[PDB]
A paper describes a structure:
Here, we use a panel of human monoclonal antibodies with neutralizing activity to long-chain α-neurotoxins (LNTxs) to investigate pH-dependent antigen binding. Collectively, these results provide a basis for the neutralization of LNTxs by the A01 and D11 mAbs by receptor mimicry, thereby inhibiting toxin interactions with the nAChR through the heavy-chain CDR-H3 loop.
An SGGS hairpin in the CDR-H3 protrudes between finger I and finger II of α-cobratoxin and is stabilized by a disulfide bond between Cys100CDR-H3 and Cys100eCDR-H3, facilitating a hydrogen bond between the backbone of Gly100cCDR-H3 in the hairpin with Thr6 in finger I. The binding is further stabilized by the formation of a short β-sheet interaction between the backbone carbonyl and amide of Cys100eCDR-H3 and Val37. Further analysis reveals the presence of additional hydrogen bonds, cation–π interactions, and a charged hydrogen bond (salt bridge) with the side chains of residues Arg33 and Arg36 on finger II, which occupy the center of the paratope. The A01 light-chain stabilizes a cation-π interaction between the side chains of Tyr100iCDR-H3 and Arg70 on the C-terminal tail of α-cobratoxin. This interaction is facilitated by a hydrogen bond and salt-bridge interaction with the carboxyl group of Asp95aCDR-L3. Our simulations indicate that the conserved histidine residue in the CDR-L1 loop of both mAbs (His34CDR-L1) has a higher probability of protonation at pH 5.5 in A01 (protonation probability: 0.59) than D11 (protonation probability: ∼0.00). Protonation of His34CDR-L1 in A01 was accompanied by a significantly increased water molecule network around the histidine imidazole group, which enables the paratope to adopt a greater number of conformational states that are unfavorable for antigen binding at pH 5.5 compared to pH 7.5 (c also).
Numbering used by the authors: 1 to 71
The structure:
């Protein structure tokens, strides 16, 4: 599967991966710089601790980097 990967934010081939993932959470700068985003690929949808969100998908490049919409 092909997925976007942080910190390059480029699409990479994960020949042995099955899903892409988007992990987001707030650090101390979340108000001014938005959530931190970790994009990657995995054989299965990884697990995240409390306060961290993860959305997994199973098609090439289905985890585009989500920027914050600027009002
Ligand atoms: Cl985590």
């Amino acid at each position: 599967i092909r997925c976007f990967i942080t910190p390059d934010i480029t699409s990479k081939d994960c020949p042995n991966g099955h899903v892409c993932y988007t992990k987001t959470w707030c650090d101390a700068f979340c108000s001014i710089r938005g959530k931190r985003v970790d994009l990657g690929c995995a054989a299965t949808c990884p697990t995240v601790k409390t306060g961290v969100d993860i959305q997994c998908c199973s098609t090439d490049n289905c985890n585009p980097f989500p920027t914050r919409k600027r009002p």
